[PDB]
């Protein structure tokens, strides 16, 4: 968690903080810490903005993380639109 807490305040200002923040949770097999922090009740999402994490989670063949992203707001119909 201290790694992420350092990770938020950096050179980038914007949407990119949350965007960059996930991909670290993807690259680690660990899901609990990432899930709690990034999936707090206060935060809003959108089913467009989880597509690259979905794609990396499928290719890297990590099952439980795919199930977590699918339970939290990625619709399969929006994901294979093209």
């Amino acid at each position: 968690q201290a790694l992420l807490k350092a990770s938020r305040s950096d050179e980038h200002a914007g949407r990119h903080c949350w965007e960059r923040q996930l991909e670290l949770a993807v690259a680690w097999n660990r899901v609990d810490i990432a899930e709690s922090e990034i999936f707090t009740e206060e935060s809003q999402w959108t089913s467009s903005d989880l597509h690259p994490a979905m794609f990396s989670a499928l290719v890297g063949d990590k099952p439980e993380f795919v199930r977590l992203l699918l339970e939290n707001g990625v619709c399969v119909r929006e994901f294979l639109e093209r």
Partner: protein, 152 residues
């Protein structure tokens, strides 16, 4: 203000989990009371009401110290589940109804939804929905798909 025969009828289905199919109907400021109770009771196959519980207040946001909230979510579903209750709320993802939604969602995986579904009725004005065009039709769209958006 003048009146006209209504529209926007069909069952809203969400893209996330293919286990819900919530029905959507509209109504005016005043509507026949017997027709309202008939639509609630005989039409949508909802069983008879045994206990009417009304969660109200807030509508913006609030934070619970995360010990009372677990007891609250657990109990407010224990009672509704077993007494065939009807719980009503202002149904919009803003504050108190979000806590009721997390209650229904956190229980709806654990029970498996065999029988006696947790009937949760909701009241929300038809003008103030952000993504309104996703279902508006005079002949309706019955297996309608809908995605979440709250940046607007």
């Amino acid at each position: 203000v003048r009146e006209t025969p209504t529209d926007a009828f069909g069952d809203i289905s969400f893209g996330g989990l293919g286990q819900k199919t919530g029905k959507y109907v509209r109504v005016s400021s005043d509507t026949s009371c017997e027709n309202l109770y008939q639509l609630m009771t005989e039409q949508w196959k909802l069983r008879s009401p045994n206990l009417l519980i009304s969660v109200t207040g807030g509508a913006k946001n609030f934070y619970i110290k995360t010990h009372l909230k677990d007891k609250f979510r657990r109990g407010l579903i224990k009672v509704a589940q077993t007494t065939g209750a009807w719980i009503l709320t202002g149904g919009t993802h803003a504050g108190v109804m979000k806590h009721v939604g997390m209650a229904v969602r956190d229980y709806t995986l654990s029970s498996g939804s065999m029988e006696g579904q947790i009937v949760v009725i909701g009241v929300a004005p038809w003008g103030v929905i952000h993504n309104r065009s996703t279902l508006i039709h005079p002949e309706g769209r019955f297996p309608a798909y809908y995605s979440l958006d709250e940046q607007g």
